[model samples]
Target: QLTPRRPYLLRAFYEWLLDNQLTPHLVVDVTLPGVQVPMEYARDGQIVLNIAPRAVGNLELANDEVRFNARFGGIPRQVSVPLAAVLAIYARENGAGTMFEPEAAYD
Candidate 1:
């Protein structure tokens, strides 16, 4: 299998955000395949999630998955997504990172 570059890019930007003491954020297309967020925060088919250290726990990011436990209005829930579902990963403070072209869902 050809490894997708998106995951590595995500990590690189995440590290950069941490180095600058900024919050890392992810703009995701919730309609993408394999996305699992029980809390329906998507507005217009997207959700802007805070992936900062203080917000999420046991974060696991991979080439095919991004998983975490986060709270939605004081209610904790699991968030999972295929890497392709991510539209962008950026520093919330300075907006430094890439915004990808939205990929179509895969079966």
Candidate 2:
């Protein structure tokens, strides 16, 4: 038996990015279910979110989902994106990070 490694990898990379003082961002597939992002902000069925410490409040990168409260167009909104719907996570500056591949465990 094996576990879905996506969450683990995500956390590791997230810490790595922050350790280097980079702003972490998530590329989410808005078309996927359980994604609670602002539809107006999404383009081409995808949305890129800023998860920097200063950008969001109470961010949670859990195994099942990622949740946070952030401001969009000067309005505060709750954001939730399932780990399965996350396409990639990277730093906003210098573009350093990795993308997720479809895994059997998640599918």
Candidate 3:
């Protein structure tokens, strides 16, 4: 009863977009705690990550966070984003995806 539904939706959309031959992207709030991304790439306190299989390595979508290794501007870096910081997941081709809503458990 204490689990949050954010992670479930995140994975669902990811698989759905990929199955439809679209690239998956993640929108994260860098301002939130436990977010580890390329600060220089972030704008307005947020960053958009291309999480398609070809884009990231060892991508993990757990109940608490999402972790992956990727290259930004040719510089390799590891990214860790808390579930609370994930703003949305969508497709780059058609913009087909859903934005997450606030959950009481995370607060």
Compare the candidates by lDDT and give the number of the best one.
Answer: 3
- Candidate 2 colliding pairs: none
Q: Identify the runs in model 2 with alpha carbons over 4 angstroms from their true place.
A: none
Instruction: Summarize candidate 3's per-residue lDDT along 11-65 as a digit string, tens digits.
Output: 9999999999999999999999999999997999999999999988999999988
TM-score leaderboard ranking: 3, 2, 1
Candidate with the greatest TM-score versus the true structure: 3
The lowest-lDDT stretch of 10 consecutive residues in candidate 3 is 70-79
Alpha-carbon local distance difference test for all models? 0.82, 0.92, 0.94
**Global lDDT for candidate 3?**
0.94
Reference-based TM-score of each model: 0.86, 0.94, 0.95
Note the clash tally of each candidate: 0, 0, 0
How close is each model in CA RMSD to the real structure? 2.4, 1.0, 0.9
Candidate 3 Cα misplacement greater than 4 A, ranges: none
Clashes of 1: 0
